Each structure stands twice: as structure tokens, then as C-alpha cells.
Design an enzyme around this catalytic site. Sequence first.
Site, PDB file in Angstrom:
ATOM      1  CB  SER A   1     -78.497  45.947  43.133  1.00 61.31           C
ATOM      2  OG  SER A   1     -78.815  46.049  41.849  1.00 61.31           O
TER       3      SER A   1
ATOM      4  CG  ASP B   1     -77.382  49.362  41.385  1.00 57.90           C
ATOM      5  OD1 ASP B   1     -77.170  49.027  42.516  1.00 57.90           O
ATOM      6  OD2 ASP B   1     -77.354  48.705  40.355  1.00 57.90           O
TER       7      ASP B   1
END
Lengths: 297, 302, 303, 301
Positions: D53, D183
Amino acid sequence: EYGNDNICRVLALDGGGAKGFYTLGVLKEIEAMLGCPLYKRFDLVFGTSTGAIIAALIALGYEVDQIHALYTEHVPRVMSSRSAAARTMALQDLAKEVFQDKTFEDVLMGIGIVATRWMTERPMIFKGNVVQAHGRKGTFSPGFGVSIADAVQASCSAYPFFERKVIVTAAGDKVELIDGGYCANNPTLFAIADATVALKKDHKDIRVINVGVGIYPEPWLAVQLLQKTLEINTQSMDQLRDILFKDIPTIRISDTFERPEMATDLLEYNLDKLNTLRQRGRESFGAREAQLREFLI
Amino acid sequence: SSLLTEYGNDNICRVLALDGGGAKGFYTLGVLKEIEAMLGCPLYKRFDLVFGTSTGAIIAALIALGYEVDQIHALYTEHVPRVMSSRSAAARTMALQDLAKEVFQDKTFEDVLMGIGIVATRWMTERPMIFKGNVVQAHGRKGTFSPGFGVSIADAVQASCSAYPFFERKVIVTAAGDKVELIDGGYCANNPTLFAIADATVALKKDHKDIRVINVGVGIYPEPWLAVQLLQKTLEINTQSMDQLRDILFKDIPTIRISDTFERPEMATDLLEYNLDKLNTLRQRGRESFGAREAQLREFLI
Amino acid sequence: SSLLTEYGNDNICRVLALDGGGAKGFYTLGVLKEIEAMLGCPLYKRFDLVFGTSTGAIIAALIALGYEVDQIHALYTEHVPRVMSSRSAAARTMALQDLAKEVFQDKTFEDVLMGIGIVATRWMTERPMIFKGNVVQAHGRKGTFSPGFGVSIADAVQASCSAYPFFERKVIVTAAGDKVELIDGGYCANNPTLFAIADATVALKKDHKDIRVINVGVGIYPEPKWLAVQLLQKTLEINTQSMDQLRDILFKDIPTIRISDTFERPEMATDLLEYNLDKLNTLRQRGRESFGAREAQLREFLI
Amino acid sequence: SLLTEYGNDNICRVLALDGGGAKGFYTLGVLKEIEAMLGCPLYKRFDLVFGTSTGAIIAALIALGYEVDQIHALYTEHVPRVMSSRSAAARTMALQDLAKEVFQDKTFEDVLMGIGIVATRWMTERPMIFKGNVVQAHGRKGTFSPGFGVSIADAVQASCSAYPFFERKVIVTAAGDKVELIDGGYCANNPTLFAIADATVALKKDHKDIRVINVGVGIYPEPWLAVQLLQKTLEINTQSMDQLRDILFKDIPTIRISDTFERPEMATDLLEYNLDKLNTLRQRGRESFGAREAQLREFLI
Ligand SMILES: Nc1ncnc2c1ncn2[C@@H]1O[C@@H]2COP(=O)(O)O[C@H]3[C@@H](O)[C@H](n4ccc(=O)[nH]c4=O)O[C@@H]3COP(=O)(O)O[C@H]2[C@H]1O
Ligand SMILES: Nc1ncnc2c1ncn2[C@@H]1O[C@@H]2COP(=O)(O)O[C@H]3[C@@H](O)[C@H](n4ccc(=O)[nH]c4=O)O[C@@H]3COP(=O)(O)O[C@H]2[C@H]1O
Ligand SMILES: Nc1ncnc2c1ncn2[C@@H]1O[C@@H]2COP(=O)(O)O[C@H]3[C@@H](O)[C@H](n4ccc(=O)[nH]c4=O)O[C@@H]3COP(=O)(O)O[C@H]2[C@H]1O
Ligand SMILES: Nc1ncnc2c1ncn2[C@@H]1O[C@@H]2COP(=O)(O)O[C@H]3[C@@H](O)[C@H](n4ccc(=O)[nH]c4=O)O[C@@H]3COP(=O)(O)O[C@H]2[C@H]1O
């Protein structure tokens, strides 16, 4: 007659409604040919709905003579109840009078009663010997520690007419059952599975004497489908039995009648008609008399 | 082709039984797509018998003809969903009739490369009707045996997919001119696993130690009068009792069952599903159920 | 009085992990019952290590103290329904303390008959607080090791069952004197299978071959602003699912058996805080049926 | 400019990047000081790199062959633009213009080193780890398409889809499968325990011949009864995983680079966009490399 001959003779009784007077006639022509009570020449006794009563009494005492009197005294009355709850009440008194306090320990011969579970949707089968089940040994109590008066009462309860039974096992878990006609109207196939797999018998050792009640004529599209689906299972289960165990000596005694004066309704409370079905069926043995003595001896 | 692995002949008999549940067969495609690639050759070169049911017959037939999984999935996503969107019960039959004529145009039961069997239920006699492929698999009356009753392989499928309350009733005419009435095969046997062992044990005599059964279902999903509930209740009792009998009788046979149970409210369907995005989720759910058991399937069939 | 058979020593080391549920612990009591009668002896005579989460902590302790299964089932339906009947955060905590007082009061982490491990999550450090029994199960700091933080079992198990939204945070005082604050052990590991694996490989260094793992869960059942709610629910499921996926990647060559089935019919909608004994009785029947399928395989593990 | 050759020993060297959002600048400051010590692109010394991420945008550019000096140029221009947009829908849109201008139609075949990107399955609740070679797989090696036949612009955009502030993303693999991802900071925020596994069971190596380098973004101060719990449980997973690592993999020489700050002169914000504030984070990275240069020289040489 003799004590033991290494021949396992099973008895699979069908059953439903008052039409069980038929098999009382068939079983009357027998027990006289033999001369001994019907449990003295048999190792297994299976019964699903109405043959369950015949299965118990044969397994723990009196002969056909007495059974007939106990069957014509209470059974013709319970069907004469215009409410679904009233039928359940008389059935409870029936199970309480013929079966007072005896349980699955006082049984004389190997017995298997058929019942259907309303939640798990697979049959429940009451047995009466340690070496009678196929798995999950340990905590195996004969008959689930239940009384025979409550085992047969559950195996006789057709849901649309009776009330769903609730049984309290010895281990303390309430099970909601119905009659064993919704899973197997013919305990013949189940009876082969006990002698073959459990009792460890060969494939030419057993003689399967199957006795029925007979076929008779009749006196929303879901209602037709119920009658249709409830007949496919019994027929397919019969055909399956013939393919798997084709090499098993069997004799099926259940004849078909087509006269209009013979149509019943599975709940006929008429002593003047059940007597005729008891008669027509004493002749259905007169055609296989020479053959049955090759099986019973 | 890209599938060129040649597996030598052996004495083991590997049986495959396909469950049917309607338009929820995408779960079966996702599982079978992983089994083929693990082998390296079309499934007709390693299996010795294939049975099927209502929606499994459309897959059980294509595996016997010689089609590969990537071709079966190319047809199962343009013909099956379009017939389930039909409103009238007469429309679901007119739409299923056009399916078999575009997949099984003219072939018969004499052009199969393995043992086959299709389940269908009779209405009058109320007994099963199984369409065999070879006389060696019959259980009597072999003198008048014709592979597939002389019926085209397209009509043998149209009869098995027709459930009564939603489709119409199928009438076929065999070789000897006998107008037989048939309905869906999900009434007599929804899981042909018990019918499959019976056909490979007393016919095609094989011991209990030389059979490898692989049952692939469609999964179990939550739900999306008095005489109506009774009907559904009776059907479940027959299916849950038929497989327990298999467990009692046939327990010395190595068997692998691949089905999955879901409980979330998102995974709620019935046997009338025609949502492309929903069916796609069912497809990738089966591939996951294979990897959990890949370590064992490699041992049965290498 | 009934269980009398004895099993000799051997080199293969077993292990037992119990998932932490709630009122749904009746499911595990069914699976453990069939396994008990099958073996024929109390479980502390065959297994060599037992981990446990919140609800399994009560069973993991009683199993380690010699109690049988027919005795745990009596102590379970007698008190637990009262704990779930309360409708306040402080009320559930009071009942949870009365429960932990009667089942065992004057007992510490030195009467355990086998190796034990109880999972609990810290509130300040945010790392697990695993109560162990012997010193050989420790990984570091083997110079100051009291067997069980000097804490008694009455409040060691009470800390594991403290679900903060419905309970109150448990405050423990160790032997050294550190006032620690803990919450439900199901926030860091709802399935102690992976933790027990790590405690039998790096400590008690058995090779992957001879480790027999048995994990008995509680079963999956349907459920009868709202943004942070769902998102909290998802985060709890992600950690549980991802931890299991991590397990079968590293320790893939270790024989294991997991007994936990799934149901989806509306008549079964069991959730947390269940106190209806009728529904809780049905779950004990399901766990008894779930063993009937794997009875042939479990006989190879336990002999 | 960067000319240095190293022999092919039998030792594997792993690089695991963490994720904190715009705080990635801290990582760049450390990498600028490591490459300069060797004098060669990082892909010629390392054999495996994972990200989550924030490290994806960096671990991807590294495995392609870029140099830290060029990554910082793109990172300083496109990243703070994403966090500047204050809307749950504009951030997911502006995140496309970041990957579409950097990874212009690239696949997982154009990589010079083992890569791994982490994401989260919304419906299955398990990780989705994109890779680039079949020798890094654990079972189901058949039907193995590198990167699932997906581009790099989308695999990186999925691992940066933080649901609270971003939207979900849908991914169509090679076999027409529509997956929904979010995510990767929900299943694992520090990809150290994942890389060590991918290099032990796959790429079978002994614990004596592995050297892991983990770099993070640092721990900074923070500037209803239902939100408290959500922020608490997210950090109970991060913790208790580093602990699980320290217990299982202990005989593996490792180094971690992340320093804790306590003054009120910081502002924990993955959504930070102040350049003067981010420039400071970049300086602390270089200041932190100096305290551990003596050991990094022993591992990388
Ligand atoms: N001949 C047959 N043909 C086809 N199916 C058959 C046959 N016989 C049994 N089954 C099915 O097999 C399933 C599981 O049988 P199991 O042998 O594995 O274990 C038994 C036993 O150990 C114990 N028990 C049994 C009888 C008793 O009086 N007290 C008691 O305690 O309970 C389980 C009973 O459960 P169900 O009865 O509900 O289900 C049965 C039945 O449906
Ligand atoms: N594996 C099984 N599992 C469960 N039930 C089974 C199974 N196999 C058969 N049955 C049932 O048993 C009944 C008699 O089967 P038979 O094998 O003894 O005789 C067969 C054969 O000789 C011939 N024939 C069969 C197939 C074909 O493609 N062409 C063809 O010509 O017709 C008769 C088929 O008629 P049905 O199919 O209508 O009835 C069957 C079925 O209800
Ligand atoms: N199997 C596991 N799986 C996952 N995580 C695990 C596991 N084992 C430990 N941990 C985590 O690692 C951290 C350090 O563990 P250590 O074993 O290295 O040191 C132990 C020991 O020396 C001593 N001690 C332990 C138990 C006891 O009853 N009395 C006692 O005195 O205290 C330290 C325990 O403190 P925590 O328990 O609070 O923290 C643990 C835990 O968070
Ligand atoms: N080191 C690790 N530590 C902890 N968990 C790990 C690790 N590595 C993987 N996993 C998890 O294991 C689950 C099953 O992975 P599998 O290895 O069994 O098979 C793979 C592969 O064959 C194929 N594939 C992979 C990459 C690619 O670029 N193209 C491609 O085609 O798809 C499957 C991917 O599935 P997911 O990624 O969704 O889930 C993974 C992951 O969550």
C-alpha cells in the site's frame, strides 16, 4: 423347529392405516405351519409404520392370536377422530395400554424400528443389540434409552393427520420425529444392510420373507405432487434393491386388487370392511405355500 | 490442444459422478477446470465411467464426446442462463429444446468414448430410466438391448432437465415405437453416486479396492402453505437418506466428495438463477474448494 | 469410574486447540464427548498440550485439572445461561465472577496435569498474554518465570472471556505487582491452532513429522452509524481467516484434523449472548453428528 | 554513474517495505543511503521484494530496474496530489492518474527480481498476493498466470484502496473472474512474515543463508465507543504479528529501520500533503541509516 442352522431369516413388515389387517391374515396362515411363535424362526424383525406394532409384540411375547385382539380393540377407534389432536390422544393411550412399561431390554429377538427425523432429515432406527450398528460405537444405548411405548408412538405419526412426536433420549436431548413412512415404506432394503454389513453374513445365507398390506384403488397442484413423489421413492427403492441384491432368496407377499368394492382410504374405521381384507390375504398365502416351506423349514 | 500427457493403462477403475442442481452448475465447472489441468489431458482419457443428472447431463455428455473443459464453459454461459429467464412454463421448454439442438445436433449414444449414463424419471411406472452406452453395463434383458434406447443424445438430455412445476413433461419415442413419459431426474436420484457404484460393481465387476469415486456437487446455499412446505420437506428427506445408505453399504471404497456449504446472506440463490455476476462468484468458489483437497486428489489420479 | 483404559508413552506428540465462541460451546461438548468414550480414558492421559481461547478456556482448564466431559457439561449449563441472561455490562461481569468462583476458587497454575496455554490480549501493549504451565514452554527471558504470572486460575480464565463491548475490562495483579489490564483473548487469536503449533516446534523441538494436530471449533451459524459496525465485523473476520491461510503454508507437512461444520437453515440462527437452553441443546446434537464422519480418520491419530 | 558488479554467492537477500501512506518519504531517505553505499541498482543485489500500500509503488518501480533517485522524482510529484483530494470518491479517481502515468501498460513478465504485492479479498476475507514467477507458488502450480494476467497499474491501485477514505476496486483476471479488493493494510501491514515464508517453503533455503531488510515509515504521535474499538483492533493485528515473527523466525539475521518520535512537532496522517512536513520525514530516514550503517555493510557488502 431346530435351534440354529446358520441361516439368517429376516422379516420386513410394511404398514399403513387400518389396512394392516391384511398382514394379520397372512401372518395367521403362518405361525400355524410353523407351530411356534413367529419370533422362533427369525433373527431380524423390521417394521416401519404399522408393522412396527406387529414387530414389537412378536419380539417380546404373545403370538398372532393375541395381537389380533389387541389390534381390533384400539386401532379401529383412533382413526375415528375428526380432529388431528384427538387422533394423537388416542394413539398415546393405545401405546400406553398395549405397551405399559417394557423397554428395548426385554426384547427377545433382534428388532429394528424405522422413524424419520424432522430436523436432520435422515431416518432414525431403533436397535436392540451391541453388534447391530455400523459406526459411532460407545455411548450406544439400546433404543436410545427410550421406552417402547414412545418409540412405536413416534413411528406411527403421519404428520398431516397426527402431531409430530417429541422424544426425550436418556442423554437429555429432545428429538422431533415423525412416522417412518416418509423415508422407507418398505424396510426390506434396510434389513439387508444389517445382516450383510453389520452381522457379517455371506451372500447366500439369508432368506428374506417380505410381507405387505396390498394395493387398492381410491374411493391445487401440490397435493397431486405429494402422492406422486411419495410413490417414486418406494418404487425406486424397490428397483434399487433388485439390482444390488439380485442374488438373495426373497419372497414378497403383497397382491393387487382392482374391484371397486375393495377401494379403501388408509383410514377406514369400518369393521365390516377390514374383515374382508383380513380374508383376502389368507388366500394370498395359499398360492406360495409350497414355496415358503423352502425358506422357513 | 496443449494437453498432451499420455497416461498408461492400468487395472484401476476411476468413476466420476456429477450432481445436478440447475443453473448452479458453474460450481462444477470451476472444480473440473482445476482437475483437468492437474492431469494434462482431456478427462475422457483417465476416467472409465461418467454419470450425471439434470444439469450434470449437459456436462456428463460433453466429457464423453471428447470436449475439453474450456469448450464446455464456452457454451454453458450462453445457453443455460437464457432458458432460466423464461417466464411461462411453456417458454422454459421451448428454450431448452433449442439448447440441445445446438450442442448435440445429430450425435447418438454410439459415438461416446467412455462409459456413460443419464438419469431420468418415469411418470407412469415411477421408476428411473438410465440411458446406458454399452451392453456390458446392463443388468439383464440384454437380448433386446439398444444403446440409448435408439433415442438421440439430444432428447435424452431435454428429458432430464425438465422439472415438472417449472418445465413441461417430455414424451420420447424409442426405436421400437414406445411413447414413454419422463420428467426431471432429480426426483428418483439427485446424487447419482449410489447409482454409479451400483453400475460399476455388479456390472463391470470390480473389487472394492480398485474403485476411485469422485463426486462433485453444486454446493449448498441458504434460501434467497401447508401442502407446499411438505413437498420440499419430502424431497430433502429422500436426498439426505439416499447418501447415508451409500455410507453404510459402500464405505470400503476410496471416495472424495467436493461440495461446499455457505451461510452468508450474500450467497443466497435458488435453482432459477440467471445473474451473470452472481454465477461468476459461484465459479471462482469451486476453484478454491479444490486447492484445499489437491494434496489428496493427486494421490487418487496422478 | 467408567474410563479405565491406559495408554503407554510414545514419541509422537499430540496437541488440542479449542476455538473461543460463547454460548455455542455446547457444540464442542458433543465432539469431545464422542472422542472421550472412543478413547476410554480422560483426555489428560493422551494429549500432551492444550490451548484455549475465551470459551474454550473453561474447558481447557477443567480438562487439565482431571475433570471428565460428563462433569463439564453439568458445570456448563448450570452457570453459563445466567451469564448470558443479564442485560447490562456490569451485570455480566458480576455473573462471570460468580461463575469463576464456584467451579474453582483456590487453584493456581500448578495443579494442571498437562501443559496448558490460555490466550488473552493486553489493552496497553496490544500483544497476547499467554498463561503457560511449565518453564520449557517459554521462548525468552528464562530467568524470571513464575508458572502462571503468579495469578490464580479463577481470574486467569475470567480475563479471557471479557468481550469489551458487552463486558468490562479485567484488571489483573501479578506476583511481581504489575497491574495489567486485559480483554477477551479472541481479539488476537480466535483459533489457537497456529500458536500451539509454534509452541511445539521452537519449544519442545519435535520435527514436523510426528506432530498430530486436532482442532475442535464451535461451528458456523447464520446471524438473525452502521459503517464502523460492519467494518469492525469485517476486520475481525479478516484476521481469523488470514491467520488460518498462513497456517497451512508453513506447517503444511504436519498431520491435522479440523472438526467444525457449517449450517445455513433459518431454524438455526445462533449468535452470541444466546441463553435459550432449547437452542443450546440442539447444538450439542450437531457436534455429536459431526464426529460420525471423521471417526475412521481420527482413529489413526489417537489410536 | 552506478557501476559495480557483485559475485553470485549462495545467499538470498530479502527486502520488505511497509505501508503508512504519504509517510513513504521516510523509506526513500533510507534507500537513498543504501544504494549509494553499494553503487549499483538495487535489483542487482536483492532477490525478492514485497510491499503493501506504500511499498507497492516503490517495490514495483524497483523490480523494473529504476533507481532511487528517479523514484523520488515521481513520488514527490504524484503521491501528495492523491491525499490532497478530500473526498472518498476523488481519491480513488486521482489514484488512477498515478499508476496510469507510471506503469504504462506493464505486466509481471517485465521484472528482473522476485516481486510480491499484497491486497485483501473483500468477500473471502483472505490475502491476494500478486507474484511474477511459478517457483514462488504453494500448490496449484497449474493454471498459474503471472500476475493473474493483470497489469501493474491495477495491482498497485488495489493495494492502496483504503475503504474508509477510498472506494473498492474490481479486478478482472485472465479467466474473466471479477474480484473485489481493498487496501492491503487489513491483512498484513508489515510484509516480513510473508516474505520469509515465500523464501523458505518456496525457494527452499536454509535459515543460515537468508538476510532480511525491513524498512518502515516510523511511529508518530496523533494530532464514539464504536470508533475507539476499530482503531484499537487494527493495531492489535500489526502487533502480535511482529511478535509471532520474532518467535518463529529467530535464526534469520534481520534488520529493521523505523524510529519513534514523541514531540508534538509531528502529525500522524497517511493523508498528509504538506511538502515542508514531508521533507522532514525524508531527512530522518538518512539520519537513521547512520546508526546502522556498520551492520548493513556486513549484510549487503
Ligand atoms: N440397515 C440400515 N440401512 C440404512 N441405514 C441405516 C441402517 N441402520 C442404521 N442406518 C442409519 O445410520 C445412521 C447412523 O448409524 P450409526 O451406526 O453410525 O450410529 C447409531 C448408533 O451408534 C446409535 N444408536 C442406534 C440405535 C439405538 O437404538 N441406540 C443408539 O444409540 O446412534 C446412531 C443412530 O443414528 P440414526 O438412527 O438417526 O441414523 C442411522 C441410520 O439412519
Ligand atoms: N446403475 C443403476 N442405478 C440405479 N438404477 C439402475 C441402474 N441401472 C439400471 N437401473 C434401473 O433398473 C432398471 C433395469 O435395468 P436393466 O439393466 O436390468 O435393463 C436395462 C437395459 O437392459 C436396457 N437398457 C439400459 C440403458 C440403455 O441405454 N439402453 C438399454 O437398452 O433397458 C433396461 C433399462 O431400463 P430402465 O433404465 O428404464 O430401468 C432400469 C433402471 O430403473
Ligand atoms: N505459543 C505462542 N503463540 C503466540 N504468541 C506467543 C506464544 N507464546 C508466547 N507468545 C507471545 O510472546 C510473548 C513473549 O513470550 P516469552 O515466552 O518469550 O516470555 C514469556 C515467559 O517467559 C513468561 N511467562 C509466560 C507464560 C506464563 O504462564 N508465565 C510466564 O512467566 O512471560 C513471558 C510471556 O509474556 P506474554 O505472554 O505477555 O507475551 C508473550 C506472547 O505475547
Ligand atoms: N508467502 C505467503 N505467506 C502467507 N500466505 C501466502 C503466501 N503466498 C501465498 N499466500 C496465500 O495462499 C493463498 C493460495 O495461493 P496458492 O499458492 O495456493 O495458488 C496461487 C497461484 O497458484 C496462483 N497465482 C499466484 C500469483 C500470481 O501472480 N498468479 C497466479 O496465478 O493463484 C493462487 C493465488 O491465490 P491468492 O493469492 O488469492 O491467496 C494465496 C495467498 O493469500
